[PDB]
Amino acid sequence: VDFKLSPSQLEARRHAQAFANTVLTKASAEYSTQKDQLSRFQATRPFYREAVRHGLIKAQVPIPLGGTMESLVHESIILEELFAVEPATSITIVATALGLMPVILCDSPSLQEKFLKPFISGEGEPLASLMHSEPNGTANWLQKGGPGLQTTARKVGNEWVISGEKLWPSNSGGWDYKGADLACVVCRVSDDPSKPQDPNVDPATQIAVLLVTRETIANNKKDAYQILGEPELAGHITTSGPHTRFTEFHVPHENLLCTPGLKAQGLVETAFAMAAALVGAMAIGTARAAFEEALVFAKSDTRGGSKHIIEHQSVADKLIDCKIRLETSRLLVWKAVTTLEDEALEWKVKLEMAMQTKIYTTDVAVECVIDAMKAVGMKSYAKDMSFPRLLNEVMCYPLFDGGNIGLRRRQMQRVMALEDYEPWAATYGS
Amino acid sequence: VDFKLSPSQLEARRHAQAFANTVLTKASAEYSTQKDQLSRFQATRPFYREAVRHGLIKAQVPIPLGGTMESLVHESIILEELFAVEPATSITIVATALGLMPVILCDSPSLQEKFLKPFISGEGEPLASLMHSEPNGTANWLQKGGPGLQTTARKVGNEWVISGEKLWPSNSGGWDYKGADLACVVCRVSDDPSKPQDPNVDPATQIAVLLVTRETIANNKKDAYQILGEPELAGHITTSGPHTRFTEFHVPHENLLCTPGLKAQGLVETAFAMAAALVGAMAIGTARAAFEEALVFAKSDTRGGSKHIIEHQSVADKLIDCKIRLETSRLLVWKAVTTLEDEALEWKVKLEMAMQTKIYTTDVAVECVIDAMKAVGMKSYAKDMSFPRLLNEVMCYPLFDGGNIGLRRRQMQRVMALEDYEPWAATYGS
Amino acid sequence: VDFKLSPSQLEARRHAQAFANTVLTKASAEYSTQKDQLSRFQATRPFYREAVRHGLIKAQVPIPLGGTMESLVHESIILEELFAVEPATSITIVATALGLMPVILCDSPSLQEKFLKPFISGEGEPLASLMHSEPNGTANWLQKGGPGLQTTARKVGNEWVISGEKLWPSNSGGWDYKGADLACVVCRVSDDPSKPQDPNVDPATQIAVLLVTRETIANNKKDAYQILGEPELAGHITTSGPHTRFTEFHVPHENLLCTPGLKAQGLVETAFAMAAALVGAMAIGTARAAFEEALVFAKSDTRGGSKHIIEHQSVADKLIDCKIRLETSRLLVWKAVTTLEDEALEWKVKLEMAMQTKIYTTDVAVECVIDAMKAVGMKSYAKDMSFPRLLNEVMCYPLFDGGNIGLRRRQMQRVMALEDYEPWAATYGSS
Amino acid sequence: VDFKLSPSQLEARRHAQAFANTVLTKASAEYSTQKDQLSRFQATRPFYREAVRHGLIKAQVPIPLGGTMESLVHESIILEELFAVEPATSITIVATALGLMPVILCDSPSLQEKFLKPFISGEGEPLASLMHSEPNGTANWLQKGGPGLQTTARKVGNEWVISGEKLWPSNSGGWDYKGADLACVVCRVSDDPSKPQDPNVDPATQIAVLLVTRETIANNKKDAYQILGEPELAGHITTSGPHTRFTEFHVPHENLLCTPGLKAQGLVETAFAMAAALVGAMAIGTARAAFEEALVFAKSDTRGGSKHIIEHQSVADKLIDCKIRLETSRLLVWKAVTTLEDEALEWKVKLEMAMQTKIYTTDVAVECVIDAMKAVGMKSYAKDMSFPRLLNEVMCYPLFDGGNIGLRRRQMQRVMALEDYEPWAATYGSS
Numbered sequence A, B: 001v002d003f004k005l006s007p008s009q010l011e012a013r014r015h016a017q018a019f020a021n022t023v024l025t026k027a028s029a030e031y032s033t034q035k036d037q038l039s040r041f042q043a044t045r046p047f048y049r050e051a052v053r054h055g056l057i058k059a060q061v062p063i064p065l066g067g068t069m070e071s072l073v074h075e076s077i078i079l080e081e082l083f084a085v086e087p088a089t090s091i092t093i094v095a096t097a098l099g100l101m102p103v104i105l106c107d108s109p110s111l112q113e114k115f116l117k118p119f120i121s122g123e124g125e126p127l128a129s130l131m132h133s134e135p136n137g138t139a140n141w142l143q144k145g146g147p148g149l150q151t152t153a154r155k156v157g158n159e160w161v162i163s164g165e166k167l168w169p170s171n172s173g174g175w176d177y178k179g180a181d182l183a184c185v186v187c188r189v190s191d192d193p194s195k196p197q198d199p200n201v202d203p204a205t206q207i208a209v210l211l212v213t214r215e216t217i218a219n220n221k222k223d224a225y226q227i228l229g230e231p232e233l234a235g236h237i238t239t240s241g242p243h244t245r246f247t248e249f250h251v252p253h254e255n256l257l258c259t260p261g262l263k264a265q266g267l268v269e270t271a272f273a274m275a276a277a278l279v280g281a282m283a284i285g286t287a288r289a290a291f292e293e294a295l296v297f298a299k300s301d302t303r304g305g306s307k308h309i310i311e312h313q314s315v316a317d318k319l320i321d322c323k324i325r326l327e328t329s330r331l332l333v334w335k336a337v338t339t340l341e342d343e344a345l346e347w348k349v350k351l352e353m354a355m356q357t358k359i360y361t362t363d364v365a366v367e368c369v370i371d372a373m374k375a376v377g378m379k380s381y382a383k384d385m386s387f388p389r390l391l392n393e394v395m396c397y398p399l400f401d402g403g404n405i406g407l408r409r410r411q412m413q414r415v416m417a418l419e420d421y422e423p424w425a426a427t428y429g430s
Numbered sequence C, D: 001v002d003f004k005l006s007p008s009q010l011e012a013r014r015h016a017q018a019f020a021n022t023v024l025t026k027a028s029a030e031y032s033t034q035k036d037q038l039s040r041f042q043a044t045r046p047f048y049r050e051a052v053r054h055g056l057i058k059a060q061v062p063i064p065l066g067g068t069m070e071s072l073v074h075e076s077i078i079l080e081e082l083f084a085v086e087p088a089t090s091i092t093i094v095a096t097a098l099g100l101m102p103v104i105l106c107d108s109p110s111l112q113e114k115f116l117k118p119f120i121s122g123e124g125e126p127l128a129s130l131m132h133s134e135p136n137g138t139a140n141w142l143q144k145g146g147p148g149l150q151t152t153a154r155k156v157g158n159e160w161v162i163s164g165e166k167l168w169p170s171n172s173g174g175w176d177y178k179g180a181d182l183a184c185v186v187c188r189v190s191d192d193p194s195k196p197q198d199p200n201v202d203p204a205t206q207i208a209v210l211l212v213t214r215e216t217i218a219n220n221k222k223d224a225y226q227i228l229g230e231p232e233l234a235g236h237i238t239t240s241g242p243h244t245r246f247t248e249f250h251v252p253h254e255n256l257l258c259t260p261g262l263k264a265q266g267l268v269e270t271a272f273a274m275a276a277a278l279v280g281a282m283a284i285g286t287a288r289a290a291f292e293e294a295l296v297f298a299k300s301d302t303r304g305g306s307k308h309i310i311e312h313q314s315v316a317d318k319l320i321d322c323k324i325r326l327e328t329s330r331l332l333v334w335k336a337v338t339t340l341e342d343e344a345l346e347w348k349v350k351l352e353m354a355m356q357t358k359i360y361t362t363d364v365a366v367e368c369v370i371d372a373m374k375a376v377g378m379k380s381y382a383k384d385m386s387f388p389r390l391l392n393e394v395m396c397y398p399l400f401d402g403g404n405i406g407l408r409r410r411q412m413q414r415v416m417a418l419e420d421y422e423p424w425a426a427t428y429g430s431s
């Protein structure tokens, strides 16, 4: 077993840090000046353009698909460094990556070639979105007996017709509310969009993913695709993840990602389990920024006393706790993404690892940021320090990407309850 | 022992809720359009005016002093109702109360009558402020052989001359930066400001409190009193607590609160100890608002499932923990204020109880808000719910009114280390 | 609102202290030498005798019923002082109090007069036991569609017949395994013990409670009431709460405590909810003993340094946290018992408050003992300090008297889910 | 970066498991019937014999030193497997390894060859102990201006004369109180023992380590080496770690490990930092036993309900939390041991990682056991389940091997406070 970073991982770190310091630090000057969530997102466009030019969107797609992704550990390193500086634009990159994932993961070369093409060109500012989340919630979307998804799809001739509402998926409406360059819309199949989900069919058997591009939208009536609103978020105030209504929205059958059923659900589940492990790196970036800011402060400030405040056991205790949280978190993230790249391990072992990772790292990042503030004291509460921003940004992570309480803990619980559950398979082999 | 409330305690609650609901709810529409801390503060002036008209500033002064305060438990009840709805203005009220406290606690009847008049008249928008905190910090203000307060006073003829900077004291610059109506300025006596505090003199013996009014500031040259800035706060975004510089600022001897030294230190400690005990009520208000919004949601929303989310054990576990924190918190606050009113108890005993209360209630309120957010899920993160506001507001509490880590725990530790420490004196007697 | 203690409350404290210091301190020298759980229990009989002589058993019974209980705050105060010194015998008193409660709470003066008699007497060593817990667990005893209690009673003639097993109930087999002087046996009504509980009927409507005495056991075959075993406990090593099998156990119909069904469930619920509130005083006692031993050590030992270890911010932080946990706990117990005594409040308001109390106090007392040990350091891990005993005894509280995970959180959760739940009714009332 | 285990790592695991299952599981029958700590330790001797026979003591010693230790990860794997079954004898193995460490780490090939020979032999039951801890504590042994270690040494002629007391060092008295085969005794140099440590000289500059064999003790007056007692511990009840008194105890100069001073301190510090990382594996084993017992239970028991208790979210939550603590803990131990092995890293970087590991894994192991107990509920509290043992055993870890509060957080704090502190140097490399 080894923890040593290769030259290309060190170089990926160097490159991510250089990009964040020279490009991302300037985003705040542009977006802070804007009035609402969409305008803040829009003032972020020149910085995503730079991200594209730095090869960062191409790095979200595997090499066999024409991208430059080196490995998931490389990716973990990048996100940490990005998020330790500025989640604006960084968020847009990872949300794009998530929106690409169902295409990346499907076993269909013609779809991949066609739909991933903008994202590997090194040009423009193409956006992708994985549109799963809804106004009514999604934690119980697979509950047998439940109403299931409320965005539904039905086949009419050689096309599918989308009826329903999405909320929260980042990037979904693109820069201009005319749509992301690629959207994967997760629907529950329903011949009659008025009828309740049959309580005798397993909901997983009814999942479809339909690909929607700016063209798919242009080919529909204006009112088939409506942006009803843009949430005003506590943190990550420069991301767009609007409220969208599909009314009789027409999609060619050839934009169906795969066969409806367990296979489509399986693509969603896999995309989101990967996000589950990677999200830890984002949480670590934010929590690390908080810890480093409080550490530097405690090593250089006496707070009107005779010694630097780090010399006070109660201050040191907080920073020790912060440090431990960060170190365990990063090890767990590298363990998780590594577990997910292991072809010899069954899916349930990977899924369990991914769930643990999202839960621990996101819960713990919050404590880390709050302990850092308590260490600094009153000064941390004002916006001449990073902490007010970090506080709001860190509370996103346990709630988003499938909240820990409703989704990730129940996904994990379900695995552990299975008769063939092997707790240590990812460590000691099966 | 008895927990029952009197008809007048119940009336204070009703009176406070009604004021909050009918008046304070309207403040957001006014302050939300202003684009800085001072402008947001100024936008709250009409609500503090209404607070005065409702007798709330008068209720901060005890009855023997011409005020209408019935007890500390009434006060706790009022603050909880107020902070449960809107800390805008509510914060101005308690900051005034703290500002008035050295005068209320001192025992010069004619000084009291003179300086408390505007606050018991039921007219205008009079502000008070206890100016203690400094740019360099104050956790070590009493550390022997340390720098001490960087705000310093010297006697010159019939007058005192203040040199130095304050930062954070709410209300200190008034509505218009010409000063609060009454500011109690905490100084370290020093004949030569350019020389360090004498390391062989106990810091507590050099403490003086000087009363500075709008007239005092008007009697000075323009560059003797200046606002250098106004912190942009994570939460409580409508309060004012600026960065003030005193340069050769002249104050009349008749404005000295009491003889410099231990009695002046004790006036400060007592004011901040009362505040330590009452601040729990503010924290309870904020956390209760979170808990109740979460509870209501959890009993009305299935999150696309077949039952209300309160029916899920993990969700209910969060609300349970929330409830418990709030209930233990309120009990401890009532215990604390009651202990402070008990004339048969030593200061040591009252102080320790006051410290415990500040520490517990303020730490636990944070957890209570965050757990409520986890229970509600993604929806808690958008500003059409109150949690973004509450998350920022609740984080003030462990940091302000003497941070838990640097000040409150150290004060409690010093009591516990005393040879004659009686841990249960407040319960079972001495 | 007032936190002042009356002369009688301070006298109950002094009295309770005097007893624990002069009597209970001597108990360890006897039970320490004993081979097993039962031997250790029997070895505490002389001390329970002294508790009866000090009127402590009589103080578990209300005054209207010939006992000397002044209030639930008095009771809280007493239990805290007792458990601070020694949970041995102290546990027996309180397991007797719980055993008496369904009788204390019933609507029948004649049942009360007959059955409470030896406990208000001031003589002998009478034991009571509320026999509810079973080998297979009880957290789901009221779940519709589940197997329910596996101790069952049928009516045959002028008698009820008990079939089944009990486990854990303290005092249940008395000093000699011929039974507690009084046992309230909580049964599921089943005409055929071999048939599974009907999934169509609310389990709560099938609850019956049957009073079983040493006489009842004597009037039965010797193999109709058997003690299968005695659990060896982590802490509270001197209690007895054996594994008891009822096979065709005959009980007179006049020993039926009340009408089976929602009324008998009410009695069990009410009894355990009062236990929920008062158990906190026991947890406080144990954790207070940990805090105080750690406080004294921290204020007197430098651990080979230049200053007493309380001067180290990290050590003080631990003591602070202990203090806070204890202070918030007591406040919560007093609020809960007073809430239980307030005749103006709906039952569910009282129940929620008792549930909170049990949950907070028992969880937090474990934290309090462990932080106390961390503060003392390595020394705390050796049996010349109290901590090894306290650690073991403290871990009982979150698990016994209805564990927090399975039972008390679920009871609380049910209340909160009700359409007319009033979170603050016990503080502010109502409508 | 790589997490995959090699064939020899997987074999090391299999071998440790086999030994734990077939040998160590039989240990309890023998020690349970003994009366006190020493007797329980002595009853353990034949299992330690079997451990030597299985190569496990030899595997505590690096290959270039004659041993068979393949790496610290191999070591970590072994310790977790052993401690997941039975810490009796297992603790004796690791206490010996600690005792061997200052010798293993010194730079003298002849001294190593001489003093390590018994331990690489494959025969007997040789014991080693690092005797550092003292009655008055050691958290402050390096505090300038403090009393310092109370066990002092001074040179008289061609020998050293030890005066004072040790407390806690496992194995220190050997099987029979005539001494461990090898004991490294840590002393503060002092010409007049009745005079206080000079407040002007750095305590670290005054540290010496003298090797004490059974022969050294044989060559002294009988009352020069006295065992004054044997602590009764809450857990790990089969270990011996006596109170020892040295009175004018003569040791040959050839038994001095190195010149007194910073180099001697450094060897003690490096020994205890290696232990600090590896103790995590011991904590993980104990807490893993607790988690697996609770998990198996949750998956096979409905607790009188209709579904296995793992289906209740609150139960699931506990098990999820235990699982996360264990996973994060093992990763951090492997990270930390691999950090200690990296020749390219500064010591401060290694030290900091080792302190983090000890603090986190040991605190978090206690939580894991407790949560597991809470999820099993009342059944976890009786000695027919593992938990009572597990609870007492797990509480040792935050306290021993340098307590978290007094020592490990202070060691970590000092490193963090240094001008040149690089937080991420073990991850991203130095600058």
Ligand SMILES: Cc1cc2nc3c(=O)[nH]c(=O)nc-3n(C[C@H](O)[C@H](O)[C@H](O)COP(=O)(O)OP(=O)(O)OC[C@H]3O[C@@H](n4cnc5c(N)ncnc54)[C@H](O)[C@@H]3O)c2cc1C
Residues within 6 Å of the ligand: A095, A098, A129, A130, A131, A132, A133, A134, A136, A137, A138, A139, A140, A167, A168, A169, A170, A233, A236, A239, A241, A396, A399, A400, A401, A402, A403, A404, A405, A406, A407, A410, B302, B303, B304, B305, B309, B312, B313, B314, B315, B374, B375, B376, B377, B378, B379, B381
């Ligand atoms: C910046 C940002 C970017 C995002 N990106 C995307 C994206 O690209 N695509 C996308 O689809 N979504 C996206 N999301 C949404 C995110 O994935 C959310 O996690 C998702 O909406 C699910 O939220 P939830 O876990 O709160 O579930 P909800 O269904 O909203 O449930 C809320 C709460 O109900 C309770 N609950 C409900 N059911 C249960 C149960 N069975 N058991 C226990 N508790 C239960 C839980 O306490 C839970 O927290 C984004 C959100 C943000 C803020």
Ligand SMILES: Cc1cc2nc3c(=O)[nH]c(=O)nc-3n(C[C@H](O)[C@H](O)[C@H](O)COP(=O)(O)OP(=O)(O)OC[C@H]3O[C@@H](n4cnc5c(N)ncnc54)[C@H](O)[C@@H]3O)c2cc1C
Residues within 6 Å of the ligand: A302, A303, A304, A305, A309, A312, A313, A314, A315, A374, A375, A376, A377, A378, A379, A381, B095, B098, B129, B130, B131, B132, B133, B134, B136, B137, B138, B139, B140, B167, B168, B169, B170, B233, B236, B239, B241, B396, B399, B400, B401, B402, B403, B404, B405, B406, B407, B410
């Ligand atoms: C809305 C608002 C209203 C306010 N009202 C007032 C007011 O009316 N009057 C007023 O004077 N101030 C006011 N303040 C400031 C408030 O009282 C702060 O608590 C005060 O500034 C002290 O800050 P601090 O506790 O962080 O101490 P600091 O001196 O700034 O120390 C900061 C941190 O350093 C560490 N530290 C320093 N010394 C030690 C030590 N010896 N031991 C251990 N750790 C140490 C601790 O981590 C501590 O948190 C207000 C602030 C706000 C935001």
Ligand SMILES: Cc1cc2nc3c(=O)[nH]c(=O)nc-3n(C[C@H](O)[C@H](O)[C@H](O)COP(=O)(O)OP(=O)(O)OC[C@H]3O[C@@H](n4cnc5c(N)ncnc54)[C@H](O)[C@@H]3O)c2cc1C
Residues within 6 Å of the ligand: C095, C098, C129, C130, C131, C132, C133, C134, C136, C137, C138, C139, C140, C167, C168, C169, C170, C233, C236, C239, C241, C396, C399, C400, C401, C402, C403, C404, C405, C406, C407, C410, D302, D303, D304, D305, D309, D312, D313, D314, D315, D374, D375, D376, D377, D378, D379, D381
């Ligand atoms: C010293 C001592 C004295 C005692 N005194 C008495 C007495 O006088 N009378 C008496 O009757 N008993 C007594 N007991 C037993 C005590 O009341 C226990 O609390 C009782 O057995 C119930 O235990 P439990 O809550 O662990 O439930 P169990 O049914 O054993 O459940 C065990 C675990 O399963 C899980 N679980 C089961 N169902 C659910 C669910 N629905 N939702 C979530 N989790 C679930 C929980 O994690 C729970 O902790 C005593 C025990 C001891 C050690």
Ligand SMILES: Cc1cc2nc3c(=O)[nH]c(=O)nc-3n(C[C@H](O)[C@H](O)[C@H](O)COP(=O)(O)OP(=O)(O)OC[C@H]3O[C@@H](n4cnc5c(N)ncnc54)[C@H](O)[C@@H]3O)c2cc1C
Residues within 6 Å of the ligand: C302, C303, C304, C305, C309, C312, C313, C314, C315, C374, C375, C376, C377, C378, C379, C381, D095, D098, D129, D130, D131, D132, D133, D134, D136, D137, D138, D139, D140, D167, D168, D169, D170, D233, D236, D239, D241, D396, D399, D400, D401, D402, D403, D404, D405, D406, D407, D410
């Ligand atoms: C099974 C077992 C095996 C052991 N093996 C060995 C061995 O092989 N060799 C050996 O030498 N010892 C051994 N020990 C002892 C063990 O290493 C202890 O950790 C050691 O005694 C130090 O204990 P301590 O950390 O509590 O220090 P102490 O000096 O006893 O301090 C105790 C407490 O005081 C407080 N404190 C003291 N100073 C400070 C400070 N400056 N700052 C903050 N807080 C402070 C802390 O709260 C601390 O926990 C063993 C013990 C056991 C039970």
Ligand SMILES: CCCCCC[N+](=O)[O-]
Residues within 6 Å of the ligand: A094, A095, A097, A098, A274, A275, A276, A278, A279, A400, A401, A402
């Ligand atoms: C790679 C992970 C990006 C996180 C996307 C947000 N979300 O899934 O809710």
Ligand SMILES: CCCCCC[N+](=O)[O-]
Residues within 6 Å of the ligand: B094, B095, B097, B098, B274, B275, B278, B279, B400, B401, B402
């Ligand atoms: C009673 C009001 C307390 C508010 C004062 C805030 N502070 O002291 O920092």
Ligand SMILES: CCCCCC[N+](=O)[O-]
Residues within 6 Å of the ligand: C094, C095, C097, C098, C170, C274, C275, C278, C279, C400, C401, C402
């Ligand atoms: C009033 C004290 C309750 C005794 C505990 C018995 N039990 O319910 O498990």
Ligand SMILES: CCCCCC[N+](=O)[O-]
Residues within 6 Å of the ligand: D094, D095, D098, D170, D275, D276, D278, D279, D400, D401, D402
């Ligand atoms: C790996 C060594 C642990 C055994 C002794 C621990 N200790 O130093 O106290």
